[PDB]
Design a protein around this ligand. Structure first.
Ligand code: AGS
Ligand code: AGS
Ligand code: MG
Ligand code: MG
Lengths: 495, 572, 259
C-alpha cells in the first residue's frame, strides 16, 4: 500500500516537526520505559498540522495503524503502540452501522460487566514437528518463549439512559482493550472509547485505545460572576426553578438545597459521613406531589425516576443473575447504583412493601449496598439522594386521629429523612382564585406567561461551579449550632 | 538455554550434591542429614530445602532457580534420589522418585499482580482455598486440582475476588483443605485451551500455577514478620497498670460514651482459649455478641469499625444473606462437572470475625443452620452424596433492632426481640441500648459530634481520662496477645462461684452451664489482655461484674432493682 | 563503625533490589525498594539513609521525580509524584544493554566499603534528594443614576446579543468544519447538523440558538457558507478547501468592526 507508506512518512514528519518545544519528544523518551508502551496523540494537533493525513487516518485507521506503529518504532529507535484522543465528534451506540467499519470514532456508554486480563498471542514462533523448522513472526487471524504476547481486557457496555429512545431495549456492545487500556475501566462507570468497529466472525465488536470519564469563555464567566453577587439570588433561583408552581416555596427551598448538597467527610477511623440530603413529601392528593419529581428529573441530567409498587427489591439495589455464556453468576445493576452521585425519585412510596424498604435501608444511611448471595460477595457504592413522594393513610389526613396514626411508616425510615414535609389542603377563596387563574393562564398563554430570572442552562452551570467548593465551619457557627440544637432537642419524629 | 549445555548442567548437579553433603549450620549440624533421616523414618516422598541458605552459599543457583525452574528442579530431584540411594540403598524399595521442595521464596506476589512477565517462573503467592477436586490417577501419579481466591481481608472494597487454578502432584495431593489460608511457591505456566480461543475469538492461554511448596498461612508467619521494636513496645505497654483503660478508650474514638458495649466487644475480640477436654467434647473459646439497640445509637458505626480493625473480617447484611450464601454449598463445576464445595461467609470467617447486620430480619429456616456452627464451630455438609466437615471457629457479632422500633423496659428481653430462646442462649454477651432525654448528656453528645466534624474536614486534613493508643499499635498488640498468651486457671476459688451460681439459679427460677463457660473464657480473655501466663482473681471479678450487668440488663424493670440490691456486693 | 556497617549492609540490599527490579525491565520505585529492604533486613527504611548513601557514593544512582507510574489497582491518583532510582552503569563495548551482574554488584559494595574506610580515615550528613516539583439625598441620587442607566439601556438589546454571538461564532465554525469532514457529504439539513453540533459543542445550547448562529454565519460570510431552500427545508453547504486561519482573521476583524 503506497498510501500506507505515505501515511507512515507523514506521521514521522508530524512526530519530528510538531511544536517552541516538540511535545512528543519527552513522551517518546518515556516510551523506552518498560511500563510505558503506548503513545497518546491529540487529534487536534494532527488536523492542524495537516488535513490530508488527518482525514486519511480518520478514514483508514485500520489500514494504516500498523504503519503508524512502525513509524513510532522508527522514531523511538532513532534516539510500541499509538493512542489517539480528543476526537471532536461523539456518536451513539444505535448509530453504529456497517458503513462505519474502519472509521476512527469514539463511543459513549456505561460499563456493566468486566472480564479478567488475558494474554493474547500476536506474533507466534511456530516449530514444525516434521522438519524442525522454526517459523517466526506469524500474525494471528483472531514456541511460547519466543512469541509476543499483549495484555487483553474484554468489556461489556450498555447504552446510556438519556440516549435510550422510549420503549427500546438498550443494546450491549463488546469492547476490546489492549496494553495500557487494560484495567483502566471499572464496572458501573460511564466512559467514551476511541477506536474502531471491527468485524468478528458475523459479530460486531469495538476495538478501543483510550478511555474517558479557568478556560471558560469570558462572557459566561462574567455572567456567573454577576449572578453570584446577587443579593436576592436565593429567592430568584427558587422562583425561576419552578415558574409554573404556585406557593409551597418551602418545598422549593428544600429541593434546591438537596440539589446543592453538603460535603462528605471520612473519619480517621475510615468511617464515611454522608454529605447528601434525603427528602420526603407526604400530602393529601391534588397537591404538587409529582410535579416536583418531574421538574427535578427534566432539569438534572443525573436524575432517575421510578414508581413504588412496580419496583422489586432486586430492581432497586442490584440482582444476581446467571450469565448464559460463562455459566457463572454475575450482578445486574439496580436503579440506586445507576443513580450514583445523582438523585433518585420514588413515587407512591407508601405502596412499596416492607420487604423492599428494608432493602433500601442500607443505601439510605451507609450509602453502600452489600450482596452476599449464592456464593457472590460484593459491596457497591450507592451515593444517591432520595426524593420520596407519598400520601397519608386512606388518602386523607383525618384530624380526628393523632399525627403518628396518620403515617404508616417505620420509625427508622421516618428518622433517616433530613426534611419531612406534610401538606394539608384547605378551602380558601383567595387560594382557589390564585390556583384557578394560574392554571387557566398556563393553559391559554403557554409561553408568554413565563418569566424566568435566570436561564436553566445558567442555573446548571452555576450549580456545577458551586458544587466543587468545600466551606469551612466557623467557631461562631459552631457554638450557634450547639445552642440551637440544645434548644431544639430539649423539646413521633424524634430528633 | 545456557543451562541446557551438558557440561555446566552436570557440573551444577555435582555442585548441588556437594551442597547437600557439605552445608553446615550455625550450630555445626549438617541439617539435611537429619532431615533425610527423618524423611526415611516417615517414608515421605519429598525433601524441603531452604532457599535462603542456598542463596547464601551458591548465588548462581539462586539466580538460576527462578529462571529455569523445571529442568533445574528435575536435576535436583535426580541428585537427591542418588544421594538417598548412596546413603540408604534400601530406600529404593519404598520409594522410586523423590522431589525437592523450595521454601521461603523472598519474592511474594498477589493473584492480581500476575502478568505475562511471570510466565514459566517460580512465584510465591498467598490466598485462601475455595474448592478442591479428588485424587486422580495418571498414566505417567496423584493429581489434585484446586481453586484459590484472594484473601478477603487483603481485597479492597468494591472489587470482586479473583480466582485461579492450582495443581498438586503426589505428596502435595490432599495437603490442603477448602477454606484454608495458604501460601504457595510454584511455577506460573500457561496452558493451551481451544474453548477459550473460540469463545473470546483470539488466542487465549489459561494460566495455571503448578505449586512446588504448600504452606498453610497460620499466624506463625505473622509472628515472624513482627519487628522486635513492636515486641518491646508491646511489653512496655503490658507493664502499665492502666493498660486496660487505655485499650478500651482506644476503640471507637469518634463515638461518645457507651462504655459497656466497647468493653464487651473488645473482650470478645481478644478471644478466649478453645479447649478439647478429653477429645470427647470440645469447649469453644469464642464469644458471640448480640447488640440490640434503639435507632440512633451508631451500631452500624461500631460494626464498620470492627470490620476495619480486624486483620480478617467479612461484612454481611440481613437481607442479602441466605442460608446457602452464609455456608458452603455443593455445585457442579461448569467445565469438569464434578461435585465441588464453595465456601460461604462463615467458612471464610474461620479464625476471623463475622458481622451480621439486622439479624432480626433472618428467616427462621436460615436461622436453623446457624446453631450448629455457633455451638460446635464446625459445619457438616451432607449434600449430593458428599459428606464433609469444615472448620467454623469464628467470632460472631450480631446487631438487632426491637420489634416496633422501641425497646420496652416493661417486658422481658425475649419478648422485645423476635429471636428464639436457643439463639439467645448461644450468645455469650447481650447488650441493649436505649435512648434517654438527658440535657447534660445531650450537650456532651452535641459538643463531641461537632468537634469531630470540625477535626475531620478534608481541608483540615474521654470517660476514663486515658489517652487512646494508635491504631497500628493496637493491631500489633492484638496480634501478639492472640499468638503468644495461653493463660491457666490454677487459682480460682470454686466455692465463691458455686454459691454465686446457686444464687443465679434461685433468681432465674424466681423470674446454665454455658454461662459458666462464657464467664471462664471471659476471664481467660481478660487475662490475655494483660499478657499474663496465669490468671489473677481480678480477672474473675471483672468478668463476674460485666456478666452480672449484662444479665440484669435483660430483665424487667420491676425486678432489676431487687437484683441490684441483692448483688450490690459484686457491682460495687 | 556499627552505623557504617549498617549503612553498607543496607546499601548492598538496595543494590540487590535495584538490580532485581531493573534486570526484568521494571521501573524501580521507592516504595518497592523500601518493601524489599524491610523484608530482607527486618529494619526501617527511609529517605534519610538514601540521602546518606548519595552523600557517600553519589555515582551509584540517579534520582528523579516522575509521574505516570502504573501502580496497578492501588487507587493512586495520577498527580502523585514518585521518586524513581536509575542505576548508573558504564556502557559495555559489546553494544548490549548494561545489566547488574554479580561482578558489578561486588565491585559496587567494595567501592562503597572503600569510601566508608576513607571517611573513617579522615554521622554522615544526608544528601539533598530531589524533591517533587441624609437618606433622602442618597436615595434621590441613586434614583437619578438608575434613570440615567435606564436611558442608557433604552438602546436595543439585540445590538449586544449579536456581539455576544459574535464571540461564539469562530469556535463553533471550527466544529462545523469538522462535522462536514466527518459526514462525507456536500450538504446537510438544519436539523441533523444542529443536533450534531449541540451534541459536540462545549456549551449546552438550544437548537434555535444554533439556527440563529448559522443564519448569522451565512449572512456575514456568504462566500464560504451557502444555504439552499429546497421544498420545506433549508440545506447547508460549505467549501472545505478554504483556509481556516484567514477566515478566523476575517471573523475577528468583523467582530472588531461591530464593536
Ligand atoms: N400549586 C399548584 N400550581 C400549579 N398547578 C398545581 C398546583 N397544585 C396542583 N396543581 C395541579 O394539580 C395537579 C396535581 O399534581 P400531581 O402532583 O400530579 O398530583 P398528586 O398531588 O401527586 O396526586 P397523586 O400522587 O398523583 S395521586 C398538577 O399536575 C397541576 O396540574
Ligand atoms: N452516640 C453517638 N455519638 C456520635 N455520633 C453518633 C451517635 N449516635 C449516632 N451518631 C451518628 O449518627 C449516624 C447515624 O447513626 P446510625 O448508625 O444510622 O444509627 P443506628 O443506631 O445504627 O440505628 P440504625 O441501624 O441506623 S436503624 C452515625 O453515623 C453517627 O455519625
Ligand atoms: Mg402525584
Ligand atoms: Mg445502624
Amino acid at each position: 500500500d503506497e498510501v500506507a507508506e505515505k501515511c507512515q512518512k507523514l506521521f514521522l514528519d508530524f512526530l519530528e516537526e510538531f511544536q517552541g518545544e516538540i511535545k512528543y519528544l519527552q513522551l517518546a523518551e518515556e516510551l523506552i520505559r518498560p511500563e510505558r508502551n503506548t503513545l497518546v496523540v491529540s487529534f487536534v494537533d494532527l488536523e492542524q498540522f495537516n488535513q490530508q493525513l488527518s482525514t486519511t487516518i480518520q478514514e483508514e485507521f485500520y489500514r494504516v495503524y500498523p504503519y503508524l506503529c512502525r513509524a513510532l518504532k522508527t522514531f523511538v529507535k532513532d534516539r510500541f503502540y499509538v493512542a489517539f484522543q480528543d476526537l471532536p465528534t461523539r456518536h451513539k451506540i444505535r448509530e453504529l452501522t456497517s458503513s462505519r467499519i474502519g472509521l476512527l470514532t469514539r463511543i459513549s456508554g456505561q460499563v456493566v460487566r468486566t472480564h479478567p486480563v488475558h494474554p493474547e498471542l500476536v506474533s507466534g514462533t511456530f516449530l514444525c514437528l516434521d522438519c524442525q523448522t522454526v517459523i517466526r513472526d506469524v500474525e494471528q487471524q483472531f514456541d511460547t518463549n519466543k512469541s509476543r504476547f499483549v495484555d487483553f481486557q474484554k468489556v461489556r457496555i450498555q447504552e446510556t439512559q438519556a440516549e435510550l429512545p422510549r420503549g427500546s431495549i438498550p443494546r450491549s456492545l463488546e469492547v476490546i482493550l489492549r496494553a495500557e487500556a487494560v484495567e483502566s475501566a471499572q464496572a458501573g462507570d460511564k466512559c467514551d472509547f476511541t477506536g474502531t468497529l471491527i468485524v468478528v466472525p458475523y459479530r460486531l465488536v469495538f476495538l478501543a485505545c483510550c478511555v474517558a470519564p479557568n478556560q471558560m469563555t469570558v462572557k459566561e464567566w462574567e455572567k456567573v460572576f454577576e449572578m453570584s453577587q446577587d443579593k436576592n439570588l436565593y429567592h430568584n433561583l427558587c422562583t425561576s426553578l419552578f415558574p409554573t408552581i404556585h406557593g409551597n416555596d418551602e418545598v422549593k427551598r428544600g429541593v434546591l438545597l438537596m440539589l446543592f448538597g453538603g460535603v462528605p467527610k471520612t473519619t480517621g477511623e475510615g468511617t464515611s459521613l454522608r454529605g447528601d440530603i434525603n427528602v420526603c413529601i407526604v400530602g393529601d392528593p391534588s397537591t404538587a406531589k409529582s410535579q416536583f419529581l418531574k421538574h427535578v428529573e427534566e432539569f438534572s441530567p443525573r436524575a432517575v425516576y421510578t414508581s413504588g409498587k412496580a419496583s422489586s427489591a432486586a430492581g432497586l439495589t442490584a440482582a444476581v443473575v446467571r450469565d448464559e455464556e460463562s455459566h457463572e453468576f454475575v450482578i445486574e445493576a439496580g436503579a440506586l447504583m445507576l443513580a450514583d452521585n445523582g438523585v433518585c425519585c420514588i413515587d407512591e412510596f407508601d405502596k412499596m412493601d416492607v420487604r423492599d424498604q428494608v432493602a433500601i435501608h442500607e443505601a439510605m444511611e451507609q450509602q453502600t449496598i452489600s450482596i452476599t448471595k449464592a456464593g457472590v460477595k460484593a459491596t457497591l457504592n450507592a451515593r444517591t439522594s432520595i426524593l420520596a413522594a407519598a400520601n397519608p393513610i386512606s388518602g386523607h389526613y383525618d384530624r380526628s386521629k393523632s399525627l403518628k396514626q396518620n403515617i404508616n411508616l417505620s420509625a427508622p425510615i421516618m428518622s433517616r429523612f433530613d426534611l419531612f414535609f406534610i401538606l394539608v389542603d384547605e378551602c380558601n377563596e383567595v387560594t382557589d382564585y390564585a390556583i384557578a387563574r394560574r392554571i387557566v393562564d398556563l393553559h391559554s398563554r403557554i409561553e408568554e406567561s413565563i418569566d424566568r430570572v435566570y436561564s436553566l442552562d445558567d442555573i446548571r452551570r452555576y450549580l456545577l461551579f458551586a458544587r466543587q467548593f468545600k466551606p469551612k465551619i466557623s467557631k461562631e457557627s459552631e457554638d450557634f449550632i450547639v445552642e440551637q440544637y440544645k434548644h431544639l432537642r430539649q423539646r413521633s419524629w424524634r430528633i | 538455554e545456557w543451562v541446557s549445555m551438558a557440561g555446566p548442567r552436570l557440573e551444577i548437579h555435582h555442585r548441588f550434591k556437594n551442597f547437600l553433603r557439605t552445608h553446615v549450620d550455625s550450630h555445626g549440624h549438617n541439617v539435611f542429614k537429619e532431615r533425610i533421616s527423618d524423611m526415611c523414618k516417615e517414608n515421605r516422598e519429598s525433601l524441603v530445602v531452604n532457599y535462603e541458605d542456598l542463596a547464601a552459599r551458591e548465588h548462581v543457583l539462586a539466580y538460576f532457580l527462578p529462571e529455569a525452574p523445571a529442568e533445574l528442579l528435575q536435576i535436583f530431584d535426580e541428585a537427591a534420589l542418588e544421594v538417598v540411594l548412596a546413603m540408604y540403598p534400601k530406600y529404593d524399595r519404598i520409594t522410586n522418585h523423590i522431589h525437592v521442595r523450595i521454601s521461603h521464596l523472598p519474592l511474594v506476589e498477589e493473584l492480581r499482580s500476575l502478568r505475562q512477565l511471570h510466565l514459566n517462573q517460580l512465584i510465591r503467592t498467598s490466598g485462601v482455598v475455595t474448592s478442591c477436586t479428588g485424587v486422580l490417577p495418571q498414566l505417567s501419579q496423584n493429581y489434585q486440582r484446586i481453586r484459590i481466591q484472594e484473601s478477603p481481608g487483603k481485597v479492597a472494597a468494591g472489587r470482586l475476588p479473583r480466582s485461579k487454578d492450582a495443581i498438586l502432584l503426589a505428596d502435595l495431593v490432599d495437603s490442603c483443605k477448602p477454606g484454608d489460608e495458604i501460601e504457595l511457591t510454584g511455577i506460573y505456566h500457561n496452558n493451551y485451551d481451544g474453548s477459550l480461543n473460540t469463545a473470546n475469538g483470539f488466542p487465549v492461554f489459561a494460566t495455571v500455577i503448578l505449586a512446588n511448596h504448600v504452606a498453610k498461612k497460620d499466624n506463625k508467619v505473622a509472628v515472624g514478620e513482627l519487628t522486635d521494636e513492636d515486641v518491646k513496645m508491646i511489653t512496655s505497654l503490658s507493664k502499665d497498670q492502666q493498660i486496660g483503660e487505655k485499650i478500651f478508650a482506644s476503640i471507637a474514638p469518634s463515638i461518645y460514651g457507651h462504655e459497656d458495649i466497647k468493653r464487651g466487644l473488645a473482650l470478645a475480640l481478644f478471644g478466649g482459649e478453645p479447649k478439647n477436654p478429653g477429645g470427647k467434647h470440645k469447649v469453644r473459646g469464642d464469644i458471640n455478641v448480640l447488640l440490640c439497640g434503639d435507632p440512633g445509637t451508631a451500631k452500624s458505626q461500631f460494626l464498620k469499625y470492627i470490620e476495619k480493625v480486624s486483620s480478617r473480617a467479612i461484612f454481611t447484611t440481613g437481607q442479602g444473606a441466605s442460608a446457602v450464601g452464609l455456608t458452603a454449598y455443593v455445585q457442579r463445576h461448569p467445565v469438569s462437572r464434578e461435585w465441588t464445595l464453595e465456601a460461604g461467609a462463615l467458612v471464610l470467617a474461620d479464625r476471623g470475625v463475622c458481622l451480621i447486620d439486622e439479624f432480626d430480619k433472618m428467616n427462621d429456616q436460615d436461622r436453623t443452620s446457624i446453631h450448629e456452627a455457633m455451638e460446635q464451630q464446625s459445619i457438616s455438609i451432607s449434600k449430593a452424596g458428599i459428606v464433609t466437615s469444615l472448620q467454623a471457629r469464628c467470632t460472631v457479632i450480631a446487631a438487632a433492632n426491637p420489634i416496633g422500633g422501641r425497646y420496652d423496659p416493661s417486658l422481658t428481653f425475649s419478648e422485645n426481640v423476635d429471636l428464639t430462646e436457643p439463639i439467645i442462649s448461644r450468645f455469650d454477651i447481650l447488650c441493649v441500648v436505649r435512648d434517654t432525654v438527658d440535657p447534660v448528656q445531650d450537650e456532651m453528645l452535641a459538643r463531641f459530634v461537632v468537634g469531630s466534624h470540625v477535626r475531620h474536614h478534608p481541608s483540615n486534613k474521654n470517660t476514663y481520662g486515658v489517652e487512646p493508643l494508635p491504631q497500628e499499635v493496637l493491631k500489633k498488640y492484638i496480634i501478639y496477645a492472640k499468638e503468644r498468651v495461653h493463660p491457666k486457671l490454677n487459682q480460682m476459688d470454686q466455692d465463691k462461684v458455686a454459691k454465686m451460681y446457686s444464687d443465679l439459679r434461685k433468681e432465674s427460677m424466681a423470674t446454665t452451664v454455658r454461662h459458666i463457660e462464657s464467664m471462664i473464657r471471659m476471664a481467660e480473655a481478660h487475662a490475655r489482655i494483660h499478657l499474663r501466663d496465669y490468671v489473677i482473681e481480678d480477672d474473675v471479678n471483672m468478668a463476674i461484674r460485666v456478666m452480672l450487668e449484662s444479665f440484669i440488663d435483660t430483665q424487667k424493670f420491676s425486678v432489676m432493682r431487687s437484683m441490684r440490691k441483692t448483688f450490690a456486693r459484686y457491682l460495687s | 563503625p556499627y552505623k557504617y556497617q549498617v549503612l553498607a549492609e543496607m546499601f548492598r540490599s538496595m543494590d540487590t533490589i535495584v538490580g532485581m527490579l531493573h534486570n526484568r525491565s521494571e521501573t524501580p520505585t521507592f516504595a518497592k525498594v523500601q518493601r524489599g529492604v524491610q523484608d530482607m533486613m527486618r529494619r526501617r527504611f527511609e529517605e534519610c539513609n538514601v540521602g546518606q548513601i548519595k552523600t557517600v557514593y553519589p555515582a551509584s544512582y540517579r534520582f528523579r521525580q516522575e509521574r505516570s507510574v502504573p501502580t496497578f489497582k492501588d487507587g493512586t491518583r495520577r498527580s502523585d509524584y514518585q521518586l524513581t532510582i536509575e542505576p548508573l552503569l558504564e556502557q559495555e563495548a559489546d553494544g548490549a544493554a548494561p545489566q547488574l551482574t554479580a561482578s558489578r554488584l561486588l565491585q559496587r559494595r567494595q567501592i562503597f566499603s572503600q569510601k566508608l574506610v576513607e571517611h573513617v580515615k579522615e554521622d554522615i550528613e544526608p544528601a539533598a534528594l530531589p524533591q517533587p516539583p441624609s437618606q433622602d439625598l442618597l436615595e434621590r441620587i441613586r434614583a437619578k443614576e438608575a434613570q440615567k442607566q435606564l436611558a442608557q439601556m433604552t438602546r436595543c438589546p439585540e445590538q449586544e446579543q449579536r456581539l455576544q454571538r459574535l464571540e461564539r461564532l469562530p469556535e463553533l465554525a471550527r466544529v462545523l468544519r469538522s462535522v462536514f469532514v466527518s459526514e462525507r457529504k456536500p450538504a446537510l439539513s438544519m436539523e441533523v447538523a444542529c443536533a450534531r453540533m449541540v451534541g459536540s459543542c462545549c456549551t449546552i445550547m438550544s437548537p434555535g440558538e444554533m439556527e440563529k448562529h448559522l443564519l448569522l454565519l451565512s449572512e456575514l460570510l456568504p462566500d464560504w457558507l451557502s444555504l439552499h431552500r429546497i421544498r420545506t427545508d433549508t440545506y447547508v453547504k460549505l467549501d472545505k478547501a478554504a483556509d481556516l486561519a484567514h477566515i478566523t482573521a476575517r471573523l475577528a476583524h468583523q467582530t472588531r468592526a461591530e464593536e
